[PDB]
Design an enzyme around this catalytic site. Structure first.
Site, PDB file in Angstrom:
ATOM      1  N   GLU A 319       0.821  -1.201   0.000  1.00 24.23           N
ATOM      2  CA  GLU A 319       0.000   0.000   0.000  1.00 24.23           C
ATOM      3  C   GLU A 319       0.859   1.256   0.000  1.00 24.23           C
ATOM      4  O   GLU A 319       0.497   2.264  -0.607  1.00 24.23           O
ATOM      5  CB  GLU A 319      -0.950   0.004   1.206  1.00 24.23           C
ATOM      6  CG  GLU A 319      -1.909  -1.171   1.247  1.00 24.23           C
ATOM      7  CD  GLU A 319      -2.596  -1.436  -0.084  1.00 24.23           C
ATOM      8  OE1 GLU A 319      -3.192  -0.503  -0.654  1.00 24.23           O
ATOM      9  OE2 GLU A 319      -2.546  -2.587  -0.560  1.00 24.23           O
ATOM     10  N   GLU A 341       0.057  -2.189 -10.187  1.00 26.69           N
ATOM     11  CA  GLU A 341       0.012  -3.423  -9.394  1.00 26.69           C
ATOM     12  C   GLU A 341       1.301  -4.229  -9.362  1.00 26.69           C
ATOM     13  O   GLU A 341       1.694  -4.735  -8.304  1.00 26.69           O
ATOM     14  CB  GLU A 341      -1.161  -4.316  -9.810  1.00 26.69           C
ATOM     15  CG  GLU A 341      -2.537  -3.680  -9.624  1.00 26.69           C
ATOM     16  CD  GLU A 341      -2.771  -3.094  -8.237  1.00 26.69           C
ATOM     17  OE1 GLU A 341      -2.011  -3.400  -7.293  1.00 26.69           O
ATOM     18  OE2 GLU A 341      -3.736  -2.317  -8.084  1.00 26.69           O
TER      19      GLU A 341
HETATM   20 ZN   LIG Z   1      -2.083  -2.814  -5.334  1.00 26.81          ZN
END
Ligand SMILES: [Zn+2]
Ligand SMILES: *[C@@H]1O[C@H](CO)[C@@H](O[C@@H]2O[C@H](CO)[C@@H](O[C@@H]3O[C@H](CO)[C@@H](O)[C@H](O)[C@H]3NC(C)=O)[C@H](O)[C@H]2NC(C)=O)[C@H](O)[C@H]1NC(C)=O
Ligand SMILES: *[C@@H]1O[C@H](CO)[C@@H](O[C@@H]2O[C@H](CO)[C@@H](O[C@@H]3O[C@H](CO)[C@@H](O)[C@H](O)[C@H]3NC(C)=O)[C@H](O)[C@H]2NC(C)=O)[C@H](O)[C@H]1NC(C)=O
Ligand SMILES: *[C@@H]1O[C@H](CO)[C@@H](O[C@@H]2O[C@H](CO)[C@@H](O)[C@H](O)[C@H]2NC(C)=O)[C@H](O)[C@H]1NC(C)=O
Ligand SMILES: *[C@@H]1O[C@H](CO)[C@@H](O[C@@H]2O[C@H](CO)[C@@H](O)[C@H](O)[C@H]2NC(C)=O)[C@H](O)[C@H]1NC(C)=O
Ligand SMILES: *[C@@H]1O[C@H](CO)[C@@H](O[C@@H]2O[C@H](CO)[C@@H](O)[C@H](O)[C@H]2NC(C)=O)[C@H](O)[C@H]1NC(C)=O
Ligand SMILES: *[C@@H]1O[C@H](CO)[C@@H](O)[C@H](O)[C@H]1NC(C)=O
Ligand SMILES: *[C@@H]1O[C@H](CO)[C@@H](O)[C@H](O)[C@H]1NC(C)=O
Ligand SMILES: *[C@@H]1O[C@H](CO)[C@@H](O)[C@H](O)[C@H]1NC(C)=O
Length: 875
Positions: A319, A341
């Site tokens: 995060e 990601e």
């Molecule tokens: Zn992520």
């Protein structure tokens, strides 16, 4: 009513993508929840840069309704008269038509569109919602938002695409007993009534709609201060306050590490973390206000496992990466999602490795991302890293192994090839260049190409614009050729059509006698290359650093098995894991005889390292699952593998001693012993379980899950099942709850499992966030395999109505059918899929699980006899 639905297609609003000529600059957003009514209202004022004459203005809205006819302002300030507003469902738009049409905003002046809206806080984990928890016997409320990817449009009307970055000034009118949080610090608080407060936050930096977050809460807090001097606080229920300590520590450590590593200041004055008691994903990187599922944030050293600790640290690190990769620089369109990601999945390991030195995190990348996704990406129904997406369902579907794990894996390969220093420098320049803007994949290659002058674009495009990966076929000791690796030998290797034709530019590394060399294997070398001493053994792809498999000649493989039996230590732990992993994947793909693969397992009585055991357990789990009902093969596979783990299982014992990795090893090694039917390991589980049922004894944290599972499986009954259910309700720790849910799913009783499935409809017992986790646990049960599968079919309409077809976890639940391996089961799947052909976010998962089950049927046909022979001849 006010903006009625219309099927009018004759406009630009028929297009899935927003138009290029309408751009927002600033949102003035005000919301007022009626918590006890599960409703909210709000007004939004949006400053708009118009670039082309238009009679219509449109933006995203779903479910939440417009209440007041929208009002438009000219850049001069005059009220633009509005003929109609209407909703366009097919593309989730609300559209307003001006009476006549107006022209571009030419200077520093902008249009201003304001609309009043009303929505619901209930029956959902997306948009803006309310959930509850119990504190000192009282039911308390908390409201929060979750938007990624296309759910901001449910919270409030907005230009809900990641490239439509705008600035945000948010205010919330809430009851005074509540605090209000958002992306930015509080600017001012003012009493509306003696009952209500208006909390206004300071202006945001430019950011994407999916990152916009607010919350209304009564949580306590645990506080820390960065090296920057900025407050990092974790909000947490008072009764759970002690469990926020570890997360607070890691946030500090990893925040300080990243800021320096990326050579860039965190863009906001503060950073908050908060776990919502019912939360639909793992965590969400909302800038300055990161939301969590409790299992990924809240950790108790006295009750939580090392596995839990690592999970918390890793998700927190993950995060935190997004505050740079994703938040400061965002992908231009969801097709480049891996820029968010994959980067977070890569750097999360660097972050946690800094905080926790002896965790061997870099090596654990192989276990977490690299090797698991090489399984995924060997299916025909995989997809390239850069993915065409044309619906909200398609967008949400690509939050998957490819975006995360393969993204992470090809960056890992890229770093090693291009060198860490240059990778680091190149990342910084990318972050400097596109700060507060959007980038494409092409933009990232060029950035690293400036830092290396190595052909980054040319090489990395091959890993990025086509699905799949190669196997390197060895001829002699050092001639290699490349071929696409597919698990299904019947599959057409050229499909789906690729411009690059499934050949790769492969950075190849190898070890000659403790010395390492590097070569770029070029696509255009159609007949392969030769690796540059007089060698008798070449170790290709050290630590499995490259995203490919190596198929040595059978003689070499045979020599490897012998070298392992004689002195397995000759290879590094990572190398051992890699060789074992490749061999079994190659055997699975009919590219290597199973006898050769199985020969590599012979040394295992002397194996003591985490990485090899994990990948052995992975390979064996598949094979064992395929023969589960085979009364002939199964006991033999069981007997053998029981024998192979027994020394290490016995050696580590049933007690929490040793460092992090040892404790992780003990868990998985004792778990496998139990799975393989070791009587003494099962007896330890049952004994501890019997003691835990006595209500006092707190189980060793790293043995708990195993005790609940195998304890319940071997000695559970209605009495202990009911007790376990009570304990699950009574514990505040989500990490414990989850283990207890797996325990409950382990009972060998149809009646009790039936009771369990019925509880899924009871939101007082099973949280909405946990329903799919439970279904999946039950599917692992020898009875539950078909029970869970039958239940999702019978209750499909119910699930769809509860979650919607846009829900990723619902789309994925069909993968509980992965172990299926008969024509009868495949027919069941196809029949159910034909009955409910609207798959939504389940379209890809359906394709993947069908391919897997078809592979399973073929696998059994091809290999039963060979595997039977190997075991029979050995035992
Ligand atoms: Zn992520
Ligand atoms: C939890 O698991 C333990 C195994 O990990 C069990 O401990 C083992 O119990 C066995 C049976 O009493 C012992 O067997 C003897 O082991 C020695 C090896 O040194 C052999 O020579 C003997 O032939 C064998 N049997 C005899 C003498 O009749 C194991 O030694 C023993 N310990 C270990 C480390 O393996 C626990 O019993 C088990 N706990 C529970 C509650 O079931
Ligand atoms: C790689 O795998 C090979 C194939 O499985 C191994 O070669 C086999 O070793 C077996 C040892 O278990 C032999 O089993 C014997 O087979 C005969 C029947 O021909 C039986 O009567 C014996 O009882 C049986 N042994 C036992 C203990 O029951 C196989 O004969 C043998 N096969 C061949 C064709 O050689 C290799 O050993 C193996 N390579 C390694 C480990 O490096
Ligand atoms: C949240 O709750 C409200 C009110 O309880 C729901 O609205 C009702 O929905 C039912 C079933 O669709 C209808 O029969 C009622 O007529 C509705 N009442 C009102 C006042 O609209 C609402 O659907 C729920 N929202 C979600 C997302 O589940
Ligand atoms: C968070 O870090 C703090 C301080 O860095 C840890 O507190 C230390 O714990 C060790 C071992 O338990 C003690 O010897 C020290 O006295 C403590 N203080 C310091 C400053 O070293 C704390 O254990 C960490 N939190 C966790 C594990 O959740
Ligand atoms: C275990 O739990 C169940 C559920 O609480 C107990 O109660 C019965 O549950 C059935 C459904 O399985 C209901 O139809 C009955 O109304 C319940 N009977 C009651 C409340 O008296 C069950 O008795 C428990 N069993 C044990 C041995 O504790
Ligand atoms: C406006 O839309 C464009 C679309 O190209 C996007 O790139 C940009 O980030 C948006 N925001 C601003 C402030 O320019
Ligand atoms: C490997 O390739 C080289 C160069 O093309 C050649 O000399 C050799 O014969 C090939 N085969 C083997 C088995 O080494
Ligand atoms: C399963 O549990 C039910 C409920 O207690 C009990 O009646 C039944 O005898 C159990 N059956 C088996 C096979 O264990």
């Amino acid at each position: 009513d006010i903006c009625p639905a219309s099927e009018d297609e004759s406009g630009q609003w028929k297009n899935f993508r927003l138009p290029d000529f309408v751009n927002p600059v600033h949102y003035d957003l005000h919301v007022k929840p009626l918590l006890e009514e599960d409703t909210y209202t709000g007004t939004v004022s949006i400053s708009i840069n118009l670039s082309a004459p238009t009679r219509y203005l449109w933006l995203h809205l779903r479910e939440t309704r417009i209440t007041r006819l929208p009002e438009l302002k000219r850049p001069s300030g005059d009220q633009v008269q509005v003929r109609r507003c209407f909703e366009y469902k097919k593309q989730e738009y609300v559209v307003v038509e001006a009476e006549e049409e107006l022209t571009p905003s030419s200077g520093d002046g902008l249009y201003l569109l304001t609309m009043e809206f009303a929505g619901w806080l209930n029956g959902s984990l997306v948009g803006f919602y309310r959930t509850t928890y119990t504190e000192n016997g009282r039911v308390k409320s908390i409201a929060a938002t979750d938007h990624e990817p296309t759910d901001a449009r449910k919270s409030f009307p907005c230009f809900d695409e990641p490239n439509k970055k705008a600035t945000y000034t948010i205010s919330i009118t809430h009851p005074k007993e509540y605090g209000a949080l958002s992306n930015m610090p509080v600017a001012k608080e003012e009493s509306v009534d003696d009952k209500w407060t208006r909390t206004t936050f300071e202006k945001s930096v430019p950011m994407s709609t999916y990152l916009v977050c607010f919350a209304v809460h009564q949580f306590d807090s645990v506080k820390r201060i960065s090296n920057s001097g900025k407050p990092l606080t974790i909000y947490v229920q008072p009764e759970q306050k002690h469990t926020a300590e570890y997360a607070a520590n890691i946030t500090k450590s990893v925040f300080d590490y990243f800021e320096e590593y990326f050579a860039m200041n965190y863009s906001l004055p503060k950073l908050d973390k908060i776990a919502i008691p019912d939360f639909g994903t793992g965590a969400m990187e909302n800038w300055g206000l990161i939301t969590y599922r409790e299992t990924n944030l809240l950790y108790d050293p006295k009750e939580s496992a090392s596995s839990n600790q690592q999970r918390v640290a890793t998700v927190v690190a993950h995060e935190l990466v997004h505050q740079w990769f994703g938040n400061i620089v965002t992908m231009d369109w969801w097709e480049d999602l891996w820029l968010n990601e994959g980067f977070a999945s890569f750097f999360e390991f660097l972050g946690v490795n800094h905080a926790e030195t002896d965790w061997q995190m870099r090596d654990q990348m192989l276990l977490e991302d690299v090797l698991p996704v090489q399984e995924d990406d060997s299916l025909m129904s995989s997809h390239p890293i850069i993915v065409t997406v044309t619906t909200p369902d398609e967008i949400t579907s690509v939050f998957d192994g490819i975006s995360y794990s393969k993204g992470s894996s090809i960056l890992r390969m890229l770093e090693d090839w291009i060198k860490p220093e240059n990778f680091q420098k190149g990342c910084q320049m990318y972050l400097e260049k596109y700060q507060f803007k959007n980038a494409k994949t092409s933009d990232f290659w060029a950035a690293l190409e400036e830092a290396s002058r190595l052909p980054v674009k040319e090489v990395m495009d091959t890993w990025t614009r086509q699905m799949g990966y190669p196997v390197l076929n060895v001829n002699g000791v050092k001639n290699i050729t490349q071929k696409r690796f597919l698990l299904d030998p019947r599959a057409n290797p050229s499909q789906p059509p690729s411009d690059l034709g499934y050949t790769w530019n492969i950075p190849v590394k190898w070890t000659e006698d403790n010395i390492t060399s590097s070569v770029l294997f070029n696509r255009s070398e159609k007949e392969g290359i030769t690796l540059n001493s007089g060698n008798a053994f070449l170790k290709i792809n050290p630590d499995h650093i490259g995203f490919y498999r190596v198929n040595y000649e059978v003689a070499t493989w045979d020599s490897i098995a012998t070298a392992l039996s004689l002195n397995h230590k000759t290879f590094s732990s990572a190398d051992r894991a890699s060789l074992i992993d490749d061999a079994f994947a190659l055997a699975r793909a009919q590219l290597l005889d199973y006898k050769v693969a199985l020969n590599l397992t012979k040394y295992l009585k002397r194996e003591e390292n985490f990485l090899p055991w994990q990948r052995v357990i992975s390979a064996v789990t598949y094979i064992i699952s395929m023969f589960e009902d085979d009364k002939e093969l199964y006991p033999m596979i069981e007997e053998y593998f029981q024998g192979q783990v027994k020394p290490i299982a016995d050696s580590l014992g049933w007690n929490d001693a040793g460092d992090h990795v040892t404790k992780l090893l003990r868990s998985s090694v004792l778990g496998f012993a139990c799975k393989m039917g070791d009587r003494e390991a099962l007896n330890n589980a049952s004994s501890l379980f019997e003691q835990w049922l006595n209500g006092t004894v707190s189980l060793p944290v790293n043995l708990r899950l195993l005790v609940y599972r195998y304890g319940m499986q071997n000695s559970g009954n209605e009495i202990s099942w009911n007790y376990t259910l009570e304990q699950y309700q009574k514990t505040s720790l989500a990490q414990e709850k989850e283990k207890l849910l797996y325990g409950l799913a382990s009972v060998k009783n149809v009646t009790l499992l039936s009771r369990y499935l019925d509880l899924l409809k009871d939101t007082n017992l099973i949280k909405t966030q946990d329903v799919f986790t439970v279904i999946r646990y039950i599917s692992y049960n020898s009875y539950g395999k078909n029970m869970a599968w039958n239940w999702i079919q019978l209750n499909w309409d119910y699930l769809v109505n509860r979650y919607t077809l846009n829900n990723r976890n619902l789309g994925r639940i069909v993968t509980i059918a992965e172990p299926f391996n008969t024509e009868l089961q495949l027919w069941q799947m196809e029949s159910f899929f034909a009955k409910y052909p609207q798959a939504g976010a389940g379209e890809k998962p359906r394709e993947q699980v069908l391919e897997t089950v078809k592979n399973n049927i073929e696998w059994l046909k091809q290999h039963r006899n060979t595997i039977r022979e190997w075991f029979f001849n050995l035992l």
